[PDB]
Amino acid sequence: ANLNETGRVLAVGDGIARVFGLNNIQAEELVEFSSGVKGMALNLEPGQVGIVLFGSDRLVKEGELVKRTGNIVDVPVGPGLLGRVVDALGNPIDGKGPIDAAGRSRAQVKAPGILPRRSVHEPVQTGLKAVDALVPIGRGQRELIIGDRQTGKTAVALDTILNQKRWNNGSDESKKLYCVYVAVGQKRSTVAQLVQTLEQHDAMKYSIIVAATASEAAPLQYLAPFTAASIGEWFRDNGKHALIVYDDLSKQAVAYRQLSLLLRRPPGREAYPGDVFYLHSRLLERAAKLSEKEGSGSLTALPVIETQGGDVSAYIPTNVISITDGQIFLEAELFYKGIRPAINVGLSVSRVGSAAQVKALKQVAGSLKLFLAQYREVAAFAQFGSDLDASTKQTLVRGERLTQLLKQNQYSPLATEEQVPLIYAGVNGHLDGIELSRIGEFESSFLSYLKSNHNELLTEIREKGELSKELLASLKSATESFVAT
Amino acid sequence: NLNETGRVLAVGDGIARVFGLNNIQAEELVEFSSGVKGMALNLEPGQVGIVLFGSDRLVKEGELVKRTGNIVDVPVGPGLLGRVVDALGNPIDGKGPIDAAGRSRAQVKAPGILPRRSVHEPVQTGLKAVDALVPIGRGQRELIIGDRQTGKTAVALDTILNQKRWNNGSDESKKLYCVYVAVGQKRSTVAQLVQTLEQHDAMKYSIIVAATASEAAPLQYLAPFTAASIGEWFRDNGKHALIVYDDLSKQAVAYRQLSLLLRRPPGREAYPGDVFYLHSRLLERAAKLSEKEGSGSLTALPVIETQGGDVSAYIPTNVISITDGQIFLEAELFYKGIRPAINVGLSVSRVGSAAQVKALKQVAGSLKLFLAQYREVAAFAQFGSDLDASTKQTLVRGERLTQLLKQNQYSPLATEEQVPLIYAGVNGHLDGIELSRIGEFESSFLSYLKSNHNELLTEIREKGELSKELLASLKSATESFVATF
Amino acid sequence: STPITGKVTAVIGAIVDVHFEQSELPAILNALEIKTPQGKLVLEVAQHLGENTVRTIAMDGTEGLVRGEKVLDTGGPISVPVGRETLGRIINVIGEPIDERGPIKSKLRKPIHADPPSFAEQSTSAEILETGIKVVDLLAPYARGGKIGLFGGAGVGKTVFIQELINNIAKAHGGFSVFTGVGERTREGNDLYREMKETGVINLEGESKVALVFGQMNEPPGARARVALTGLTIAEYFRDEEGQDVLLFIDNIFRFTQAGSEVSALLGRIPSAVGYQPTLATDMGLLQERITTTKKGSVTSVQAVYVPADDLTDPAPATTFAHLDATTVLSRGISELGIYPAVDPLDSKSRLLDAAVVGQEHYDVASKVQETLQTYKSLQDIIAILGMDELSEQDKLTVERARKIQRFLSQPFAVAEVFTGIPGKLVRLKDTVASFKAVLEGKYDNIPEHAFYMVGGIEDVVAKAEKLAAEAN
Ligand SMILES: Nc1ncnc2c1ncn2[C@@H]1O[C@H](COP(=O)(O)OP(=O)(O)OP(=O)(O)O)[C@@H](O)[C@H]1O
Ligand SMILES: Nc1ncnc2c1ncn2[C@@H]1O[C@H](COP(=O)(O)OP(=O)(O)OP(=O)(O)O)[C@@H](O)[C@H]1O
Ligand SMILES: [Mg+2]
Ligand SMILES: [Mg+2]
């Protein structure tokens, strides 16, 4: 009966437990009960203490024994997690034997200071043309993936992982980009099948999976993002680059509002607590580009938010947008018209893209984003059937060609070198003359023309990554000649 | 004593909390020193919360209170017929003491899954728009939902009056005793409602359970259940009883009041979670007993008042989910002249033909069709004659078919008088007649048959069906009157 | 021996508070019993108020309880009998028979509260589950161990479409079925049971194929919110023991969320958005996750869905759809055209309708069928106004093509043999794909439309065309 490291359960319910004792316990310190269930001292009061339950309250009985861990909740971090599927605690759930961790890190880490940071400048090829052209992602950026149910939110994050294989199998390190997928509030089958696809594409070797199924208690889903974050932070400090994707943060807040409401906290907008902002805030901040003194490491994050009826004006969504460095909205309408990925250039944004985009794309794609923005305004304004002038009509013909060119099938990542050529033609107008139903076949036929003929241009844009004043001319004469035939 | 008695600790809001009665039962009645009685709904370890059936001016602090050892019970049996009682079951009309054949608990469990039969005995309401369109069945739960001052009571009220056709007969398995449950209505209204049934000789088989608005909340809470038992009597003994709850909306409000004052958790719109359990445990009491149980039956016509057509509200959603059909009424339809304003479009019945006379079913199967296409081509009626002949034909029927359903209040018609009107309408023998003379058409037509074709009417009343011979004889008699008209 | 007793200290609605002995309080979610004149009262543990006092939810009426009465502890969560003995038997949430067919002589008794199968036990590939309906296997196929949404109330023969899936699977996969009714209307529950004896899905003398577990509406929220788990348990038995492709029917998943909302309401828990319970998110998973395909067997869920105020933004629906894999809609306008079942080809969609799942052939075949019907829906205007002659050689062709495909969708229900009198048929996915494949190519344009109505098989289609033509001569 040592009321200094152990206490007795006074009451239990609603997923909270009030234990009596533990006078030497730290705030937010991991604990364990007689049943073996892990808890956490979320609050400390005189004469009692509040503990959250990471398991079913069934296992917690009133009057049991409660021992403390003596360390805050932490998760195994290291290179040995690669190819291995764990939960919120860091324990293996795949059954390939215990995890080989190099160390243990707190579940709640503070974001790097302002001084130990640098602006992002390292492009991160996602494989998607419409993406790495309008709203590119760089090492240390926080690109949001907002969209409604079944719109292709993960389809953009998933293809990114498979495209990294092109550098993960290389000798150089600064080129490789580790991946850490986070699944919270999802189904068992949904994740299992997701893992299988990774193995088929042999991408699981360089990817870590953290699980927080819906069946699992809410808190697990709450701590899953934070812990999973620390797993990738390791690569950052070692001078390596990591990439973590939350799927999805919107469910988390729902899981957290649960414990929030259970602990009796004044409801806010949409029944979310006022501190819901600090939730996603503290999580995203831990993704940036460190200075050279730190190790020149980075941590790119891809949070996912699910909206209702294409409402980006919702609460949860806006809170995330006021943190992330750009969004990639996925309207359902465009998704049904075949336009996939259904990227809505209107709401899509990149706060640090050009800074971390290949110069070869910056040149060929100039004012393409703003044009498309104004495109939908005149396009949806001429869809009435009324006759327009030559000025609006001319912009209406070129807009349609670009829109169809942005389209791309899934599991079909294209090299930057392959993307540069396509954009060039769109802006110039060579496609305008081309029929609308031939835009698709044209792309596959145009790429073969360069490989079979002007291969030299492809090899130049690959290494150099910039279009000189000379290569610009050799390219024009090479496309114009193809448009004619 | 402290075990059979208690002291008032606090009184107010028509609820006094007493201390003692350590052996009191749940929802049991109790009696105060003054004389006012109450029932304990909340049984706390320290004190016992008890609602009042009278002013809280009588109850003081420290006052003594004693048990009654009886749960809310009301006297049932055929003695109530022609009387007017309150929630408890005492006389308020001043006709002397009641003669009951026993008592039944306010709270009775609904008939199990096995002791029932598919409804098959029609409940002729005497409303053409009802018995033709939305047929009601002995044991069914048809809901009369509609805004204020729409004609909700008219539906039920006419139904009762239309029962003089069988109740003054000799056969019992044909009669139908009516039990009206006045909740939240001023006395003046009840005194009139009663006075109407008398001027029509309907009190002879009607039971009035008055629960005026001035009466304590609990009274308005127990009223529906009290009356429920009364009718079940008839059901259990192998008969037929019709009970109309007018209205459940007021009941919920009363119950909400008690629940809030007792400091129970408030839900949507300030209704406790057990509010649905309230109505579900009431409506399920009415049904159709099987042959082994007594073939008895209890029909329910609950009344719900919406606020501006909002059927999406909490209370309505609960009721509509439990019942087996609605007789939606709209004020708008009322203004046009269509009285009773029964929105054919919304009004539905899950039992349908199962409980409708085949004599009318043979002419009603098609009447739902024409009306259906009429609501679709109703906008065309507002345009010039430029309408093609095809659609125009629909308008010709609809205008007239809708004009026939218009039935004056307090003027129910037997099936023998409905069939002739529907048959002439469906075939289209009125299309040639002006849409202004449709009213007098019913009058002069009925009087015709009852003097020249009386033999046809009486054969439909007894057989309940229409043989190929009648179908031809009815058609010939119609075409003859339409001709001479 | 091990007799646990306590005493009721508080009675507030369906919420009763019992006091047990120090350091002897039963855990949470357990089953407490109380003696009642009728039979017995059941109390499910919920919270430990403290001071050796626990709060439970009533599974039946609470009127009559008195402070002090003894309260027995079973020691374990509510239990329901499992085995072939439940087939053809009406079981309530408590696990006791109410069909008046005596006690269910079972060998084992599993609890309603079970942990969701582990990650490692999960499959790594979704497969299609052959039902027996062309409108299904070709358009919106059922996912093996997935969740299917059934829309449309009575009038569309919902019941008829349910008993069907129970028969087919019983003959193709030989897996039993489990029907679970949450807040089921006592009226409908009766007519259902009786109908099932008339169709043959349930035989008293012979062998039943489906177990019934209804949860009346006149029951307290406590029982309502557990009915689903009761039926789930029985189904998991035949998954892990006999390893069968059992089907779990839930009607309706909506009242299951409503049930929770009333329960969490009385407990005092603060109301979330729209009024629903905060715990809603976790509860939904404690039921959907348990329904999956394991290495032993599999459980396919066929649960109806109700859209609150025709709004899909609402939490309850929003949350439900997050687990649904396919949806079989039943429109009135479909049964109005004499098309049975009333399954709507346009609304019925599946998450397993890809070439990487059903194959490239199956995919293209299904896609063309939808394309043919889609363009036909838009022509339903210019045709009924300016005649049909208002179409090109390519348009008028597809139009006459769709007329055959839409009718060909129909299929005689083997369960409704005593209803219609026409012999039912069981179409397999192997023949289904080959059927429409030959119609699209235009190899039956000389064949009358009536020759595709209520046809069991493509081979039978021609068998009927020859008879009709012979009768004309
Ligand atoms: N570019 C594309 N072309 C064709 N189909 C696509 C494309 N992108 C996605 N899809 C399809 O959309 C389906 C929906 O899956 P996806 O994960 O993309 O939706 P989601 O919005 O991410 O769902 P969730 O957010 O619940 O994970 C996928 O199965 C995939 O086949
Ligand atoms: N069938 C009818 N024919 C003519 N008048 C009618 C008819 N039905 C109702 N009324 C008129 O309706 C008025 C009362 O309507 P009614 O009592 O049916 O509505 P209600 O449902 O009782 O509304 P409230 O909730 O205010 O009582 C009377 O003034 C009467 O003139
Ligand atoms: Mg996604
Ligand atoms: Mg009224």
Side-chain angles (χ1 to χ4, degrees):
Chain A
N2 182 65
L3 301 179
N4 297 307
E5 299 181 306
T6 175
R8 299 292 184 189
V9 179
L10 299 176
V12 61
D14 293 317
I16 185 194
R18 296 184 306 185
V19 183
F20 188 113
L22 299 176
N23 290 304
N24 295 304
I25 188 178
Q26 294 182 312
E28 294 179 314
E29 174 181 314
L30 182 59
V31 303
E32 187 181 44
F33 303 109
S34 186
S35 182
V37 177
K38 305 173 180 179
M40 180 184 85
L42 80 85
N43 69 59
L44 289 66
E45 312 173 52
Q48 59 174 55
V49 59
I51 308 184
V52 54
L53 301 177
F54 290 69
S56 59
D57 52 313
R58 181 179 180 283
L59 279 63
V60 184
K61 181 206 298 180
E62 184 280 293
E64 286 181 320
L65 198 167
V66 183
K67 305 178 179 184
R68 66 167 186 178
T69 295
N71 296 304
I72 304 169
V73 186
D74 60 313
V75 293
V77 294
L81 290 63
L82 297 177
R84 302 299 312 286
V85 180
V86 299
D87 66 305
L89 300 174
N91 306 307
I93 57 177
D94 53 305
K96 290 178 186 177
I99 299 302
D100 178 55
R104 305 299 294 292
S105 186
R106 306 288 181 192
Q108 300 302 311
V109 186
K110 297 182 303 294
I114 60 183
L115 177 57
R117 283 194 191 193
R118 184 177 170 176
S119 178
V120 298
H121 55 62
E122 302 181 49
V124 180
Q125 292 180 49
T126 66
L128 299 181
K129 299 183 301 295
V131 178
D132 296 308
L134 298 177
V135 289
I137 304 174
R139 286 176 184 79
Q141 186 179 305
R142 298 174 296 184
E143 188 70 46
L144 178 59
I145 307 184
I146 186 182
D148 299 288
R149 177 197 173 190
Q150 294 175 317
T151 58
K153 293 188 296 298
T154 296
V156 185
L158 181 61
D159 288 318
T160 306
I161 313 172
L162 301 175
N163 182 65
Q164 300 304 300
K165 192 182 58 178
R166 187 61 64 176
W167 301 295
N168 297 306
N169 292 307
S171 296
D172 185 50
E173 298 297 304
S174 54
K175 295 291 181 308
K176 299 176 181 180
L177 182 63
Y178 298 70
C179 190
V180 181
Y181 182 62
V182 182
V184 305
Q186 289 188 304
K187 302 178 58 185
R188 293 290 184 178
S189 56
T190 305
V191 181
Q193 300 169 307
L194 185 157
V195 177
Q196 182 67 301
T197 300
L198 299 180
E199 300 178 309
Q200 294 179 314
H201 300 305
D202 189 50
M204 177 54 71
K205 57 187 181 187
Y206 53 70
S207 303
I208 301 178
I209 300 301
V210 178
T213 59
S215 54
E216 288 184 305
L220 296 183
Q221 300 178 318
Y222 162 71
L223 184 59
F226 294 114
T227 60
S230 301
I231 302 182
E233 288 183 307
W234 189 74
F235 305 117
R236 178 192 59 179
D237 304 293
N238 299 309
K240 301 180 181 178
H241 306 306
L243 176 60
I244 185 180
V245 182
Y246 307 108
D247 185 50
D248 59 67
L249 296 176
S250 190
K251 287 177 185 300
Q252 169 187 40
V254 178
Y256 175 63
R257 86 174 168 189
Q258 178 177 309
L259 302 174
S260 182
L261 294 173
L262 297 168
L263 306 177
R264 302 182 180 289
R265 299 289 172 72
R269 195 181 311 281
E270 295 179 320
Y272 295 103
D275 60 307
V276 64
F277 183 64
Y278 196 57
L279 178 55
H280 302 62
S281 174
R282 187 200 301 190
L283 178 64
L284 298 176
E285 290 298 302
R286 295 190 304 178
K289 177 68 175 54
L290 295 178
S291 71
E292 303 178 41
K293 181 177 67 180
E294 300 303 306
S296 303
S298 66
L299 180 56
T300 304
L302 300 177
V304 178
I305 303 296
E306 178 178 315
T307 53
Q308 301 296 66
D311 183 53
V312 301
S313 186
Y315 185 66
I316 300 304
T318 61
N319 297 302
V320 184
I321 301 178
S322 63
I323 308 180
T324 60
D325 305 300
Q327 306 76 55
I328 307 183
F329 180 75
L330 300 173
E331 183 180 58
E333 295 184 311
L334 301 174
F335 183 70
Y336 182 68
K337 303 172 181 310
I339 302 175
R340 308 178 175 181
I343 307 177
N344 181 60
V345 188
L347 290 176
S348 304
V349 52
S350 191
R351 299 199 190 184
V352 285
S354 292
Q357 186 185 300
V358 183
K359 295 181 185 177
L361 292 170
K362 171 180 177 58
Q363 294 177 303
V364 294
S367 298
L368 178 55
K369 187 187 182 49
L370 304 173
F371 182 62
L372 300 174
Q374 180 68 295
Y375 170 62
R376 196 190 61 181
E377 306 305 320
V378 301
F381 185 72
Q383 72 178 49
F384 299 118
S386 63
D387 58 307
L388 291 184
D389 59 302
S391 183
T392 59
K393 180 181 183 181
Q394 178 70 58
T395 59
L396 181 61
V397 181
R398 181 180 302 176
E400 300 175 303
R401 306 302 185 288
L402 298 175
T403 303
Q404 300 301 294
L405 183 57
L406 301 174
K407 299 187 303 175
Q408 184 175 47
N409 298 304
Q410 181 181 52
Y411 300 122
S412 296
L414 298 176
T416 299
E417 61 183 46
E418 306 176 43
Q419 303 178 44
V420 178
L422 302 180
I423 304 176
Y424 180 66
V427 185
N428 298 315
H430 308 300
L431 302 173
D432 291 347
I434 309 179
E435 305 177 45
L436 189 58
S437 62
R438 295 178 63 182
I439 301 294
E441 60 177 306
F442 190 101
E443 176 181 305
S444 59
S445 300
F446 180 67
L447 302 175
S448 304
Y449 186 74
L450 298 177
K451 305 176 181 301
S452 297
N453 298 297
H454 306 292
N455 180 56
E456 298 177 307
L457 303 176
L458 304 174
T459 62
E460 296 294 304
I461 305 176
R462 179 184 305 179
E463 300 176 307
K464 300 295 178 60
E466 184 182 50
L467 302 177
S468 57
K469 304 175 175 184
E470 182 67 299
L471 302 174
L472 182 55
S474 299
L475 181 58
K476 177 182 64 184
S477 298
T479 64
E480 294 180 310
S481 68
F482 186 65
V483 185
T485 62
Chain B
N1 196 317
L2 184 61
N3 307 306
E4 306 307 308
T5 62
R7 296 294 183 179
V8 182
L9 180 59
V11 59
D13 303 311
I15 295 184
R17 290 166 311 188
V18 181
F19 194 113
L21 305 181
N22 299 313
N23 301 301
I24 189 178
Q25 300 179 298
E27 292 180 310
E28 175 180 319
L29 302 175
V30 303
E31 183 183 47
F32 294 69
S33 189
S34 53
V36 61
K37 296 181 292 170
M39 59 178 286
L41 301 165
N42 292 304
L43 297 180
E44 309 180 50
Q47 52 183 54
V48 184
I50 307 179
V51 300
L52 297 183
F53 297 120
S55 294
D56 59 301
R57 167 183 180 72
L58 294 174
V59 180
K60 299 193 180 187
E61 182 189 314
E63 182 183 59
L64 181 55
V65 63
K66 60 179 175 177
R67 296 180 54 181
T68 68
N70 295 306
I71 312 305
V72 188
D73 63 306
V74 60
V76 297
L80 294 173
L81 279 64
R83 301 306 298 287
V84 180
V85 298
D86 68 309
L88 297 171
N90 302 309
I92 66 180
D93 51 49
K95 290 181 174 186
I98 304 183
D99 288 50
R103 300 190 176 280
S104 304
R105 289 192 188 174
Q107 303 290 61
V108 177
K109 297 302 172 289
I113 307 298
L114 179 56
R116 292 197 179 192
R117 287 197 54 182
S118 61
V119 189
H120 64 291
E121 300 176 297
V123 180
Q124 281 146 303
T125 57
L127 298 177
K128 313 171 58 180
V130 183
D131 302 305
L133 299 175
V134 187
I136 297 176
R138 289 179 181 169
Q140 187 185 312
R141 308 180 299 294
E142 184 59 36
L143 175 60
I144 307 181
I145 179 182
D147 295 303
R148 71 191 161 273
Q149 305 181 297
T150 55
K152 291 186 307 299
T153 290
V155 177
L157 184 60
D158 282 320
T159 305
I160 300 178
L161 301 176
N162 181 54
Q163 305 295 296
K164 301 192 294 290
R165 303 196 181 280
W166 306 282
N167 293 321
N168 298 293
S170 303
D171 183 53
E172 295 301 293
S173 56
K174 190 176 297 188
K175 296 181 179 187
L176 182 59
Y177 304 116
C178 288
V179 181
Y180 186 66
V181 184
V183 185
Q185 297 176 304
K186 51 183 190 181
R187 284 175 182 73
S188 46
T189 296
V190 179
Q192 183 56 47
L193 188 153
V194 175
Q195 172 177 318
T196 302
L197 296 182
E198 292 173 54
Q199 299 174 311
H200 293 64
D201 186 49
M203 278 312 263
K204 180 65 178 302
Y205 57 73
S206 302
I207 305 170
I208 299 296
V209 184
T212 56
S214 49
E215 287 178 317
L219 291 181
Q220 293 174 312
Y221 165 58
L222 301 175
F225 296 117
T226 299
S229 306
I230 305 181
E232 289 182 314
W233 191 76
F234 303 115
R235 176 176 57 67
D236 303 303
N237 291 298
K239 300 193 181 177
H240 315 296
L242 180 52
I243 185 182
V244 177
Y245 303 112
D246 190 56
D247 55 288
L248 293 178
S249 308
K250 301 297 170 68
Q251 172 200 38
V253 177
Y255 185 62
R256 179 177 68 171
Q257 176 178 327
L258 298 183
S259 282
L260 300 173
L261 299 168
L262 296 169
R263 301 191 174 293
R264 308 179 172 185
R268 183 176 175 182
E269 289 188 314
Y271 291 111
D274 63 4
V275 60
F276 181 84
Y277 181 68
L278 180 56
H279 300 167
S280 61
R281 182 186 51 179
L282 179 63
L283 305 176
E284 293 296 300
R285 295 177 66 174
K288 180 62 174 66
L289 297 182
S290 58
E291 292 182 303
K292 181 178 188 178
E293 182 57 58
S295 302
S297 58
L298 178 50
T299 306
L301 302 176
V303 185
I304 297 295
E305 179 177 63
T306 54
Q307 302 292 46
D310 181 60
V311 299
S312 180
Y314 189 63
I315 305 293
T317 296
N318 290 312
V319 187
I320 301 190
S321 182
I322 310 178
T323 65
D324 301 315
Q326 303 72 61
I327 308 175
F328 199 116
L329 305 183
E330 302 187 307
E332 193 189 37
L333 295 184
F334 189 93
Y335 305 129
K336 285 180 174 63
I338 314 185
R339 302 164 173 185
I342 305 169
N343 188 58
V344 188
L346 295 168
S347 299
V348 299
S349 175
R350 309 190 66 178
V351 177
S353 299
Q356 175 186 303
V357 182
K358 291 182 194 173
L360 189 52
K361 174 183 170 56
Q362 290 178 310
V363 295
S366 55
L367 177 64
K368 188 179 181 292
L369 183 60
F370 301 117
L371 296 173
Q373 302 174 305
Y374 178 63
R375 295 187 305 286
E376 300 175 311
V377 194
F380 291 67
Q382 299 178 296
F383 293 112
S385 181
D386 300 297
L387 308 179
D388 56 306
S390 171
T391 70
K392 179 183 307 176
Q393 177 59 52
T394 300
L395 281 62
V396 185
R397 290 292 174 71
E399 293 179 56
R400 292 168 180 70
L401 296 174
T402 304
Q403 187 64 49
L404 291 175
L405 304 174
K406 292 185 183 180
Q407 177 182 314
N408 298 299
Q409 188 178 34
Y410 302 123
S411 300
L413 302 175
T415 300
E416 53 182 312
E417 294 178 310
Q418 294 181 314
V419 177
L421 301 164
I422 301 301
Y423 182 67
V426 179
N427 299 306
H429 290 57
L430 288 64
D431 302 313
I433 310 184
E434 295 179 316
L435 184 61
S436 169
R437 303 182 298 177
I438 300 293
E440 59 178 303
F441 179 68
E442 184 187 45
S443 297
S444 57
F445 180 66
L446 294 177
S447 64
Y448 180 65
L449 284 63
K450 299 173 61 176
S451 305
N452 291 305
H453 303 291
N454 187 56
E455 299 180 48
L456 303 178
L457 298 179
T458 55
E459 186 180 318
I460 303 183
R461 186 180 61 179
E462 298 179 311
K463 293 182 66 178
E465 301 177 304
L466 302 176
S467 305
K468 297 179 185 182
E469 300 65 56
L470 293 178
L471 300 176
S473 297
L474 184 57
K475 187 181 64 61
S476 177
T478 303
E479 298 171 304
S480 182
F481 181 66
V482 183
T484 177
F485 186 66
Chain C
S1 293
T2 59
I4 306 172
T5 307
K7 295 182 178 58
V8 181
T9 57
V11 184
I12 302 179
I15 303 300
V16 180
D17 295 306
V18 185
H19 185 291
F20 294 67
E21 303 303 309
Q22 59 181 52
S23 62
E24 297 190 318
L25 293 62
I28 302 174
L29 298 179
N30 279 330
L32 293 63
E33 296 188 60
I34 301 181
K35 305 173 57 182
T36 68
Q38 297 66 51
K40 70 183 174 182
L41 180 57
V42 181
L43 300 184
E44 183 180 305
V45 186
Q47 301 179 314
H48 294 192
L49 299 175
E51 299 182 307
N52 302 306
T53 312
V54 296
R55 182 176 296 177
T56 65
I57 59 179
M59 310 298 280
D60 190 59
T62 63
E63 177 180 56
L65 293 172
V66 180
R67 298 195 304 301
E69 297 181 309
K70 295 176 183 179
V71 178
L72 172 57
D73 189 54
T74 62
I78 306 177
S79 292
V80 301
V82 295
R84 302 184 171 184
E85 299 298 310
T86 65
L87 301 173
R89 302 292 301 291
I90 310 176
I91 304 174
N92 60 44
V93 54
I94 304 302
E96 302 182 303
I98 55 180
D99 53 36
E100 304 181 42
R101 303 290 305 290
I104 305 177
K105 299 179 181 182
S106 181
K107 184 180 177 178
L108 297 176
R109 297 182 57 77
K110 298 297 186 178
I112 56 177
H113 299 292
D115 297 52
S118 175
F119 171 72
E121 303 177 302
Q122 297 294 306
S123 309
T124 57
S125 186
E127 55 181 305
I128 302 310
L129 185 62
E130 293 181 319
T131 61
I133 306 184
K134 297 178 292 184
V135 183
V136 176
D137 298 304
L138 176 65
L139 300 172
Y142 281 56
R144 181 181 175 182
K147 293 68 178 186
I148 298 76
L150 182 65
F151 297 62
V156 301
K158 186 178 60 67
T159 56
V160 185
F161 182 66
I162 298 180
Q163 305 171 303
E164 187 63 58
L165 300 178
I166 304 178
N167 184 48
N168 294 316
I169 303 303
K171 298 295 186 298
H173 301 290
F176 297 120
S177 298
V178 180
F179 188 101
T180 301
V182 176
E184 185 60 51
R185 294 178 189 71
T186 307
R187 188 184 52 72
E188 293 184 306
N190 182 53
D191 298 305
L192 185 59
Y193 184 89
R194 179 187 61 186
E195 191 176 44
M196 302 186 79
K197 300 180 294 183
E198 297 179 309
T199 179
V201 303
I202 303 181
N203 200 42
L204 303 176
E205 294 181 307
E207 300 303 303
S208 304
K209 298 179 181 72
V210 55
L212 298 179
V213 176
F214 301 112
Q216 298 175 304
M217 313 179 76
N218 55 57
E219 297 179 303
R224 301 168 51 178
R226 306 299 177 183
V227 185
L229 302 174
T230 296
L232 180 58
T233 308
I234 308 175
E236 297 178 309
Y237 190 59
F238 305 129
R239 182 190 59 178
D240 300 292
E241 186 66 48
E242 299 181 314
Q244 298 181 313
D245 308 310
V246 179
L247 300 70
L248 178 58
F249 292 73
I250 299 178
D251 179 56
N252 187 299
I253 189 66
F254 172 67
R255 287 181 289 286
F256 174 68
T257 297
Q258 295 297 54
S261 178
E262 303 175 304
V263 181
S264 177
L266 299 172
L267 295 178
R269 304 178 170 180
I270 303 177
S272 190
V274 194
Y276 297 74
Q277 57 293 333
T279 60
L280 171 47
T282 66
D283 291 312
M284 184 62 88
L286 302 172
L287 181 60
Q288 300 298 58
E289 297 299 298
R290 300 174 57 176
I291 308 174
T292 185
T293 303
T294 60
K295 299 176 182 178
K296 302 181 179 182
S298 58
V299 178
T300 308
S301 170
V302 184
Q303 60 183 53
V305 178
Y306 178 66
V307 186
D310 301 303
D311 167 311
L312 294 173
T313 75
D314 186 300
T319 304
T320 304
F321 282 60
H323 298 290
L324 299 176
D325 300 301
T327 61
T328 306
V329 184
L330 298 175
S331 176
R332 181 67 51 74
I334 304 300
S335 69
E336 184 180 54
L337 302 180
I339 305 293
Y340 300 116
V343 187
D344 182 50
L346 289 175
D347 290 315
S348 294
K349 301 182 177 179
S350 177
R351 292 177 53 72
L352 297 183
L353 193 57
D354 185 58
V357 185
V358 295
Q360 182 67 295
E361 179 181 53
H362 185 294
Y363 183 58
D364 297 307
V365 179
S367 301
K368 298 293 180 305
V369 180
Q370 300 178 305
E371 184 177 51
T372 304
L373 299 173
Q374 183 62 56
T375 64
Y376 178 64
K377 181 182 180 180
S378 66
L379 299 177
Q380 298 295 57
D381 299 302
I382 60 178
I383 296 301
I385 298 181
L386 301 178
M388 304 207 64
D389 57 302
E390 296 295 305
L391 296 173
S392 66
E393 297 302 310
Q394 183 178 313
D395 294 311
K396 69 179 60 183
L397 183 60
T398 61
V399 177
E400 184 183 51
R401 296 182 178 290
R403 298 189 172 285
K404 297 181 181 62
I405 302 174
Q406 177 181 311
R407 300 290 183 180
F408 188 68
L409 299 177
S410 62
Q411 178 179 319
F413 290 70
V415 298
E417 184 181 53
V418 296
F419 290 65
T420 59
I422 295 74
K425 297 290 183 299
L426 179 59
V427 188
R428 305 186 54 71
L429 182 58
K430 299 297 177 181
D431 182 55
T432 304
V433 182
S435 292
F436 296 75
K437 183 182 178 180
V439 181
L440 298 173
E441 299 177 313
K443 294 182 180 179
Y444 299 109
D445 303 300
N446 58 60
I447 310 294
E449 180 179 311
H450 185 62
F452 292 70
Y453 182 65
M454 298 296 285
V455 289
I458 181 184
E459 294 182 309
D460 300 300
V461 180
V462 183
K464 182 175 183 181
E466 294 180 316
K467 298 180 182 179
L468 298 177
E471 297 180 307
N473 296 306

